[PDB]
Amino acid sequence: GPAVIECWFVEDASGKGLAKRPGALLLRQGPGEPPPRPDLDPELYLSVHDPAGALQAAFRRYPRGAPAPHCEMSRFVPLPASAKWASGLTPAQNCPRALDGAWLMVSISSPVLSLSSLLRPQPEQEPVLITMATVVLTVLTHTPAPRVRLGQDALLDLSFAYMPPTSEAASSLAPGPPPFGLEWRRQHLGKGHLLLAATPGLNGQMPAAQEGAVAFAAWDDDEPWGPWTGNGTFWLPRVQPFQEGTYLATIHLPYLQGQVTLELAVYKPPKVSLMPATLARAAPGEAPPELLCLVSHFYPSGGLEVEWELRSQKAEGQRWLSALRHHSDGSVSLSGHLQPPPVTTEQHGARYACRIHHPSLPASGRSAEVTLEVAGLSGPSLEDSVGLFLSAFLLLGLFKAL
Amino acid sequence: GSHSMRYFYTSVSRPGRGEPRFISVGYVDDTQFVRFDSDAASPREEPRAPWIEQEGPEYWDRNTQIYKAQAQTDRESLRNLRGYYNQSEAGSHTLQSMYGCDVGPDGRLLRGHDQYAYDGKDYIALNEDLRSWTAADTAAQITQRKWEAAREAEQRRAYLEGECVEWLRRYLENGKDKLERADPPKTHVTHHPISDHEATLRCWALGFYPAEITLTWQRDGEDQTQDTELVETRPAGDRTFQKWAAVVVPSGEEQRYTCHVQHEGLPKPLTLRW
Amino acid sequence: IQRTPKIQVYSRHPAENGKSNFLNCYVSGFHPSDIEVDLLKNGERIEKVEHSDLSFSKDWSFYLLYYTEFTPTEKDEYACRVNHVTLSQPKIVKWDRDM
């Protein structure tokens, strides 16, 4: 419960290129004069009235001690939705009269939530120290940066709340929640898709959903009078690495849009194995075998750090890798190669170790070990004794022969 | 098959080393045919393909002036975005714009692109419907709303469905001897014993154009997609491409496996055995 | 965001000892565009190395191809060493004649 959110009003005029000015949002004014802020421009100091209560409730339970949320304000002019699927929300060309006045779009991002609000300032000398603004549409998500294992489901959260603005004595509409549109798109690496489009409360043809995705798009109730809360949760059945990136969710009402963005990251922990596993060969000097360390089926490809150790010490020997090998599931495999120097008696029982640090892995990483065998004073086996006897017998027989 | 024409603009800021460097390139099927570079000794729009060299000097002077104006605009946008994002002026940041048209084998428009990126991340893009825009942050949404008010998407749709496709067809005709060719791949299998009880079969495809190709490994007609390693398609350096696919198999069982190769230049898909 | 270059080192044609050929290092998928690439023969940088113009991919990344004439020899070894802002020390990838 900050009770105040510092915000950056971003100029929209072409002449001023993304200029920024200080402002504040006063979620809870409380009985009495609001805190004086002579440093702020009067129009950018807002006291927020939320009949729906979504914006208030979002920060009422905000974690203590967390960094202040990043807020940005901008001026908003209602426009009809340009997407063709959302064409039934505004059948008539005439702009609604109830949407007259000034509008502010507020975007508040944080590690715990991402929120967007449409506010209506009141022009309202003496009370100029504060500007009263009422919330109209709020769209928030509590999963602004989901992490999903490869092959698992994603449940991108989305909630919204809508209180219709003052009708200006023009509220001759059907009692009950108004129909709305829900849009879910993806953007990543210069590639965008309309994953899902819905218009709950209105019957029409929507573009087919992609990747078998569905949404819980509905009003939470059908009461005749607002405010109304609603759900827009996104369910992505199986998450492959090609579905990573930015997911944009938009709620559409006639001439009103509310957008939030999420960052979906896909991961898969590597499987590490040191291919030479039969200990090693003799070490009378020189002739060391080359050790291969295979890390298989890990995503993302980048960020993997392979290190060689002697068992703890920094292993010695030439080191290199191999170009990434890409699997059908989208993961990648890598091979490290170590060529140790001439092994001798001093390395008897010492293990060459390959250790992998990856973002998906724990802080310790994953390790593989190969023991370095050396030549010692091993006694002859029974088969060796039999072979010695047979060789001596054959040699003495040959000596007798010649 | 499918063809495309793309134009890339890239402005890279160099604090303390002069004004941002600006590069503009035009590609047909990933082959460049025109280039500009502010670092170049002569700031001119230089053709770099044999199938565009027959055009007149006016087509080059006009482009050079257009690209100088684009360089100034991109430098201004770089400064504005660095200011907005609250980043140090001693760092290096890049602004990229791409626009073009992807046309199918029938010569009819399939897709039209008009995208921007800042520091390698999507900034604002035109959607597949050529009507709306995708913008994530507030700075991009301001431009989105300005463009929607001004109805720039209509002009971009008119251009992409018009001049872009016409020029793509003209290029594909004037340079069909290399743009519309189809070199089949040369293929062979290689055997490498990894351990005493496992081998690796590597299927090669060399010297093929275009780059689009499909390599698969099958065991008695069943795909082995999960257990199949792949190297990305790479340029041989002489206008053709290389690729290979590797499958690990039990020692002794190297005859049931088959490599299936699909490419345009091949009249029929190829089946290869060790 | 920043992306680390992906490196491949190969030859224009299948390697035959005693036959002239081109050795290619293909670096792709990195951001930003500043990058250092060297081709090493037995650990030593090669002087006569050409490269193509910086190229641009639809995914907002860059790629480059360095190449040099060489005659494959059983004794000699070759590698590509790449340094980029996204990696601590230069990464070397060796030229496996059959990979």
Ligand SMILES: *[C@@H]1O[C@H](CO)[C@@H](O[C@@H]2O[C@H](CO)[C@@H](O)[C@H](O)[C@H]2NC(C)=O)[C@H](O)[C@H]1NC(C)=O
């Ligand atoms: C939006 O809808 C989702 C899905 O219906 C809600 O999540 C479900 O919540 C119920 C009750 O808590 C659980 O039993 C289900 O397991 C949840 N489903 C999933 C897929 O997680 C979600 O709570 C709704 N959002 C709001 C704010 O009402």
Ligand SMILES: *[C@@H]1O[C@H](CO)[C@@H](O)[C@H](O)[C@H]1NC(C)=O
């Ligand atoms: C830029 O970041 C600094 C450091 O956190 C902060 O003090 C300053 O207020 C920021 N400026 C803007 C305009 O956000």
